[PDB]
Amino acid sequence: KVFGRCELAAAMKRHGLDNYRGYSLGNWVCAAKFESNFNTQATNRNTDGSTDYGILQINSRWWCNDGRTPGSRNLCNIPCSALLSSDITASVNCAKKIVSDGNGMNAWVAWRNRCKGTDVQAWIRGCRL
Numbered sequence: 567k568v569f570g571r572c573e574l575a576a577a578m579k580r581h582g583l584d585n586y587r588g589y590s591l592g593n594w595v596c597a598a599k600f601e602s603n604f605n606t607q608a609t610n611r612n613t614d615g616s617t618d619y620g621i622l623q624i625n626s627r628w629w630c631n632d633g634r635t636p637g638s639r640n641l642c643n644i645p646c647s648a649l650l651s652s653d654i655t656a657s658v659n660c661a662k663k664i665v666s667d668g669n670g671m672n673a674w675v676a677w678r679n680r681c682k683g684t685d686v687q688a689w690i691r692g693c694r695l
């Protein structure tokens with residue numbers, strides 16, 4: 567599923583991401599835009615053999631099991647394929663664990679390079695929330 571901007575904002579708000587660990591909703595929408603272009607089916611392979619999955623490009627090196635990342639962890643206790651669903655619940659719940667692990671949203675490279683320090687409220691401007 568390719569979300570619209572306001573559609574995704576509303577879904578993330580319903581799932582408790584607005585101001586989660588102090589990160590306003592626009593931070594999460596901005597991260598999703600630049601990580602996946604709002605596409606739940608996005609995958610990308612990393613140099614070390616791990617793979618990033620879904621709307622927030624969660625990495626199999628630490629967070630999910632895809633059966634092809636030897637020596638990795640599965641800290642969200644999910645198969646990576648669950649992060650590709652049209653229902654974003656699994657991605658949001660895993661993202662909550664990630665952002666709570668000490669480094670905040672700096673875990674998302676695209677957030678750090680394209681969202682951090684910008685006017686992220688623009689990503690939810692005009693949306694009915």
Ligand SMILES: [Cl-]
Pocket residue numbers: 571599
């Ligand atoms: Cl957009």
Ligand SMILES: [Cl-]
Pocket residue numbers: 590591592593686687690
């Ligand atoms: Cl915001």
Ligand SMILES: [Cl-]
Pocket residue numbers: 631632633634635636637638
């Ligand atoms: Cl594995």
Ligand SMILES: [Cl-]
Pocket residue numbers: 577653654655
């Ligand atoms: Cl949902």
Ligand SMILES: [Cl-]
Pocket residue numbers: 587588669670671
């Ligand atoms: Cl933080």
Ligand code: NA
Pocket residue numbers: 626627628629630631632635638639640
């Ligand atoms: Na893994």
